Symmetry: C3
Subunit: 106 residues, 3 copies
Amino acid sequence: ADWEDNMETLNDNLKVIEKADNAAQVKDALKKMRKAALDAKKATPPKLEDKSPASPEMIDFRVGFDELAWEIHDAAHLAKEGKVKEAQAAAEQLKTTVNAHWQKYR
Amino acid sequence: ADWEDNMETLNDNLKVIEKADNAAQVKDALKKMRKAALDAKKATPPKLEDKSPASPEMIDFRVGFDELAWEIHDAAHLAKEGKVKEAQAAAEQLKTTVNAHWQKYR
Amino acid sequence: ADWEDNMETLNDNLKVIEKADNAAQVKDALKKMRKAALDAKKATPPKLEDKSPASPEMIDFRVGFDELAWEIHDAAHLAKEGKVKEAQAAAEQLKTTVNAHWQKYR
Ligand SMILES: [Mg+2]
Ligand SMILES: [Mg+2]
Ligand SMILES: [Zn+2]
């Protein structure tokens, strides 16, 4: 796919996570987030449409999505342990990371 | 690296997992699977031999092995929670992901 | 950022981990190690400053830091389970891996 839809999936599942009631919902939403982040690793953002796929910029873009995958992982750990509130709290910081990323590469 | 046999290693450790009797065997096979997935990140498959290490096709190859490493992780998490049979089910789905990769890239 | 400073962050947190007494200390230092390894994915090491960002050499350099992040992951899992000493042992081997990497690329 392409970058815009991966950002859309990320924010859709962040909203699911805020709205959720139990650990299972958070876990599934985080799985969709990790899938979307790994997918965005394959896309080229609008702002870097003019830069090479091997340019330093594209490397930092992909590594940023590896960092997002690892943060998602930690939140998924909280959700798998059953700590719904702590997972929701972690997801708020994930939202900070996602909105900043969308801001930069919009 | 050496793409050809990392696929062999993943298939053989899936054979190990299906045949396995205890939690320990599946975890060890999953750790060997993660090693093989990450290692395969370094190689070039046949289908991409005339392509750049940085070609978009090559980028998608490497990201696909990140996805495989993350799937393996979920399977290992299950085996670590004490859910040996749930882990073997996850491994069955890994079997579909891996042989899917053998086609297209061989 | 910068490669050698990432190496120094890894070495300092290895020391913190060996001297620590509780799971929280080990977890905090390993999370810092994971941050620094993922960051190092973004740098270019001295030995490869003559190579393309898309070179096979640079690809292997980045994949090695994916491997280091996964090993850090396993140690953090040990620390979360309450196995403080096993996490420290795992960290000693992380030190072996790090000093090998520091030698190869330097
Ligand atoms: Mg920095
Ligand atoms: Mg971890
Ligand atoms: Zn984990």
